Amino acid sequence: MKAPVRVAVTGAAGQIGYSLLFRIAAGEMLGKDQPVILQLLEIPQAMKALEGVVMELEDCAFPLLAGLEATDDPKVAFKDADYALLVGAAPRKAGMERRDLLQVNGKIFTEQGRALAEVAKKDVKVLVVGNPANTNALIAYKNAPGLNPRNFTAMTRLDHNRAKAQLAKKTGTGVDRIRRMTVWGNHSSTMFPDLFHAEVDGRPALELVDMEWYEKVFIPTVAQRGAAIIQARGASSAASAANAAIEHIRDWALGTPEGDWVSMAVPSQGEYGIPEGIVYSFPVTAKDGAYRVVEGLEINEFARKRMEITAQELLDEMEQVKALGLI
Amino acid sequence: MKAPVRVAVTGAAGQIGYSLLFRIAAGEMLGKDQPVILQLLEIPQAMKALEGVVMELEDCAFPLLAGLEATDDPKVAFKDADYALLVGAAPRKAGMERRDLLQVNGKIFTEQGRALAEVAKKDVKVLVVGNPANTNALIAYKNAPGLNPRNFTAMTRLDHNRAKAQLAKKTGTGVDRIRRMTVWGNHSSTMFPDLFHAEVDGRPALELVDMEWYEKVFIPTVAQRGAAIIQARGASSAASAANAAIEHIRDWALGTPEGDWVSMAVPSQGEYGIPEGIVYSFPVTAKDGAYRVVEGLEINEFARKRMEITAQELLDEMEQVKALGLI
């Protein structure tokens, strides 16, 4: 049997957490042979609701759930954490400006970054889901002295999955036959879904679809997908976002399939010329807890242009954060 | 690997459906080697929302999801279905008598019962989750001419899991070391969680706990658990109920553990002296799609009294529906 690992999840009583927790406890994230201890965190006002979630988790009689703890203290929630899913972020309110959102989020992730650095395992793997993901991750790792910045990542996996789904639908082929999809940059409207290196059942994607469709239909649709779901359901995409979070962690810890790669926003070390420091989505392979950016990919003018734009949007956000003295 | 199976689900855009659908598509209900085709049904007014759910399902890029269809037509949703999860039920409206609620549900399950008999597979396995589950299941199979009544079941697995959870917490042992739990009767306040045949780590349950605790703490607590979740979360227990539905179908389709059994409400054939016809929860073992009631168990006065009380409640209900000409 495997020794239990501790998984910390913030914003645990929220929508994403409600879809997320039960699948983790069922062993879908780290394997059916891996027991887990869930350490849940919420703000004081949501502890009552979190209590209700804990009861539902007990009511599932999960054999792999070796422990369950709920708290409103980050130093308790992150204690000896092996994995940390930072889902909770600043709730957008009325009269609240862009800079106001940055300050409140700045406060949350500086505090959480520090707590992780103090009480979590030294090799703790972190995934930031709360928006703005890439920048909150920057704030966190920048305020986590002693921890490896590459252990801090942001989620672009949802966009990655949305792109594969759209391509599969268009080509009329199973999504399981789509490989080497890449989403570059920021988790925002400037994200760049790359079809230049994607393959559909062995054949290059651009041999089955044209540039007109790619530029005029594919890109806008993947970018608008979150909005389409809100317009349809009247609520955000919690379940698909939860699924993406699980796959992000799963592939990072268990490894990416042979001949394929996934999208992960990680602190840049200059790959493809992207400025160092910013959390940027890159194509990556993973093996036993460690990932590596896939280098050597040919970047044409169309791609570089879009890659530059989204990188610039991230540099701008960092400037604002620095201005507020958060990093 | 296996040939795809068609799984029909009603009330698909609701809370239970939202927690249920993604785990089925992930392969948690019938196995990681069993592709599934989801045929979702909703009332006309919720189709827009169901479309949003369909998009989220697509955005998960599930390899086992071989097909996905949404509709407001029962005859379309249940066509060639191998499994049918009847989650949707009549919504409770202000100023709506008990007889009124019974009529609305009656119309629903009469129509769905007729639809299943007309277009579904003759060996279709049906699980009724929408309340009142036991009675809704009676109406359904009574109006499904040509189908084996025993393929129609009601869910009591959530109460079953809740009871296991409470015993584990009390005895301080892992929920996985709890066996032969039984919940008899109706899915209501008269449900009877039986600890007389339950084992905790190989030892009889009543050897670690006394009758006082069992009678005044255990039974009332399991009966009030749903209310506790509502008071804490401000919402019903959607996720744990979805988990229960998955396990119900899973243990029925794939089979129960050796030397153990689970709770399932099935049409009575006189077992244990229970009136025939009414859907009553019994301890049951299953293997490859077929289940058998565990007979021969010793029933003491304490158990027998409670078994009759819940049986009587079910007869009264059947009485009312038969009075409304529903069956």
The CA distance from A61 to the nearest CA of chain B, in Å, is 6
Q: Is B28 on the interface with A (CB under 8 A)?
A: yes
**B244: chain A residues, CB-CB within 8 Å:** 60
- Beta-carbon separation of B52 and A28 below 8 A: no
Q: Report yes or no: B63 at the A interface, CB cutoff 8 Å.
A: yes
From the CB of residue B254, how many other CB atoms can be counted at a distance below 10 Å?
Answer: 15
**Exposed, middle or buried by CB within 10 Å (0-12, 13-18, 19+), for A260?**
middle
User: Mutate which of A23, A42, A233, A237 to test chain B, going by most B C-beta atoms within 10 A?
Assistant: A233
Which of A48, A58, A229 lies at the smallest CB-CB distance from B56? A229
Contacts by B270-275, CB closer than 8 A, 24 or more apart: B271/B295, B272/B297, B272/B299, B272/B307, B274/B307, B274/B311, B275/B311, B275/B314, B275/B315
Q: Which two tokens stand for residue B292?
A: 């058998």
Beta bridge partners of A204: A199
Q: How many other C-beta atoms lie within 10 A of the C-beta of residue B49? A: 18
Most B CBs within 10 A among A24, A45, A59, A180, hence the mutation to make, goes to: A59
Buried b (16+ CB within 10 A) or exposed e, B112-123: bbbbbbebbbee
Beta bridge partners of B178: B200
- Tell me, yes or no, if A52 comes closer than 8 A to chain B by beta carbon: yes
* Domain housing A215: 155-326
Residues within 8 A of A (CB atoms), B 215-234 only = 225, 228-229, 231-234
Give dist(CA A1, CA B157) in Å, integer: 28
Residue that finishes a domain, picked among B154, B174, B193? B154
The residues near B107 (Cβ < 8 Å, ≥ 6 apart) are none
Reduced to 3 states (helix: H, G, I; strand: E, B; else coil), residue A17 is helix
Window B:79-108, CB contacts with A under 8 Å: none
Contacts of A312 (CB under 8 A, 6+ apart): none
Q: How many Cβ atoms sit within 10 Å of the Cβ of residue A310?
A: 23
Give exposure, A150-161, as e/b (b: 16+ Cβ within 10 Å). ebbbbbbbbbbb
B26 touches chain A (CB under 8 A): yes
Pairing between strand B199-200 and B279-287? Answer: unpaired
Interface contacts (A, B; CB < 8 Å): 128
For residues A314 and A167, membership in a common domain is answered with: yes
Indicate the pairing of strand A279-287 with strand B152-154: unpaired
The DSSP annotation for B153-205 comes to EE--HHHHHHHHHHHHHHHTS-GGGEE--EEEB-SSTT-EEE-SS-EETTEEG
B98-119 vs B133-142: helix axis angle to the nearest 10? 50
Q: Are residues A58 and A190 in the same domain?
A: no
C-alpha–C-alpha distance, residues B176 and B157, integer Å:
15
CA atoms of A222 and B271, how far apart (whole Å)? 57
Q: DSSP letters of B268-305? A: -SSGGGPPSSSEEEEEEEEETTEEEE-------HHHHH
Contact residues on chain B for A178, CB-CB shorter than 8 A: 61
How much is the CA Rg of chain A, to the nearest whole Å?
A: 19
CATH of the domain at B69: 3.40.50.720
How far apart are alpha carbons B189 and B186 in whole angstroms? 8
Q: Which residues contact B32 (CB under 8 A, 6 or more apart)?
A: B64
Q: Can B197 be counted among the known catalytic residues? A: no
Q: Are residues B283 and B159 in the same domain?
A: yes
A275-307: b or e for each residue (b if 16 or more CB lie within 10 Å)? eebbbbbbbbbbeeeebebbeebeeeeebeebb
Amino acid in the structure at residue A89: A
Instruction: For B124, list phi and psi in degrees, rounded to 5.
Output: -55, 130
**Do β-strands B182-184 and B178-179 pair in parallel, antiparallel, or remain unpaired?**
unpaired
Cβ proximity of B15 and B34 under 8 Å: no
| Interchain pair B239, A22: CB under 8 A | yes
- The phi and psi torsions of A203 (rounded to 5 degrees) equal -95, 145
Chain A 237-256, residues with CB within 8 Å of chain B CB atoms: 237, 239-240, 242-244
Do A76 and A168 have their domain in common? Answer: no
Burial B54-65 (b: 16+ CB within 10 A, else e): bbbbbbbbbebb
The DSSP element (H or E) to which A5 belongs, if any, is strand A5-9
The shortest CB-CB distance from A49 to any of B18, B234, B243 is to B234
The verdict on A67 and A80 lying in the same domain is yes
Same domain, A195 and A274: yes
Mutate to test the interface with B, among A22, A28, A56, A225 (most CBs of B within 10 A): A56
B144 shares its domain with B171: no
The set of residues, in sequence order, having a beta carbon less than 8 Å from that of B40 and lying 6+ positions away, is: B8, B9, B12, B17, B21, B50, B53, B54, B68, B69, B70, B71, B77
Q: CA–CA distance from A302 to each of A65, A224, B170, B291 (Å)?
A: 48, 21, 64, 61
Percent helix / strand / coil, chain B, rounded to 5: 45, 20, 35
- B229 to chain A, minimum CA–CA distance in Å? 5
Write the DSSP string, A144-194. Answer: -TTS-GGGEEE--HHHHHHHHHHHHHHHT--GGGEE--EEEB-SSTT-EEE
Element (H, E) at A19: helix A15-25
Neighbours of B230 (CB within 10 A): 13
Q: How far apart are CA A34 and CA A26, in angstroms?
A: 10
SS3 A263: strand
- β-sheet bridge partners, residue B152: B126
- Helix runs in A29-86, H state only: 47-58, 74-77
Tell me whether residues A63 and B26 touch, CB distance under 8 A: no
Q: Answer whether A39's CB lies under 8 Å from A24's CB.
A: no
Residues B124 and B37 in one domain: yes
A316 is written with which tokens? 């701008």
Whether residues A60 and B169 touch (CB distance < 8 A) is answered with: no
Catalytic residue among B160, B187, B197, B248: B187
Angle between helices A238-254 and A157-171 (to 10 degrees): 100
Q: Are residues A68 and A147 in the same domain?
A: yes
Measure CB to CB from residue B232 to each of A28, A51, A169 and give the nearest one.
A51
Q: Does B33 touch chain A (CB under 8 A)?
A: no
User: Which one of B125, B154, B183 terminates a domain?
Assistant: B154
B53 lies within 8 A of chain A by CB? yes
Q: How far apart (Å, rounded) are the C-alpha atoms in residues A217 and A170?
A: 11
Question: If you measure CA to CA, which chain A residue comes closest to B47?
Answer: A232
Cα distances from B240 to residues A6, A46, B18, B42, in angstroms, run 22, 19, 12, 21
Contact between residue B184 and residue B173 where contact means Cβ atoms under 8 Å apart: no
Cα separation, A286 vs A142, whole angstroms: 23
Residues B164 and B311 in one domain: yes
Annotated catalytic residue: which of A160, A187, A197, A248? A187
Q: Are B54 and B68 in contact (CB under 8 A)?
A: yes
Is B32 an 8 Å CB contact of chain A?
no
Final residue of a structural domain among B107, B123, B154: B154
Cis peptide before A283 (omega within 30 of 0): no
* A205 token code pair: 């994607």
The reply to whether residue A229 touches residue B60, judged by beta carbons under 8 angstroms, is no
Burial letters B169-201, b for 16+ CB under 10 A, else e: ebbeeebebbbbbbbbbbbbebbbbbbbbbbbe
Q: Considering its fold, how many domains does chain A have in total?
A: 2
DSSP three-state, residue A265:
strand
The alpha carbon of A36 is separated from its chain's Cα centroid by a whole number of angstroms, namely: 20
Same-domain pairing of A135 and A164:
no
Amino acid code (one letter) for B212 = E
Q: What is the Cα–Cα distance from B109 to B111, expressed in whole angstroms?
A: 5
Question: Is B17 annotated as belonging to a binding site?
Answer: yes
B143 and B245, same domain (yes or no): no
CB contact under 8 A, A55 and B228: yes
Asked if A177 and A259 count as a contact pair (C-beta separation under 8 A), the reply is no
CATH number at residue B165: 3.90.110.10
Distance separating alpha carbons of residues B47 and B41, to the nearest angstrom: 8
Q: Do A23 and B26 touch (CB under 8 A)?
A: yes
Q: Which two tokens stand for residue A85?
A: 């899913």
Nearest-CA distance B7 → chain A (Å)? 19
Dist. CA B116–CA B144, nearest whole Å: 7
Q: Omega before A132 cis (within 30°)?
A: yes
Interchain pair A229, B169: CB under 8 A: no
Angle value at C-alpha B213, between B210 and B216, nearest 5 degrees? 140
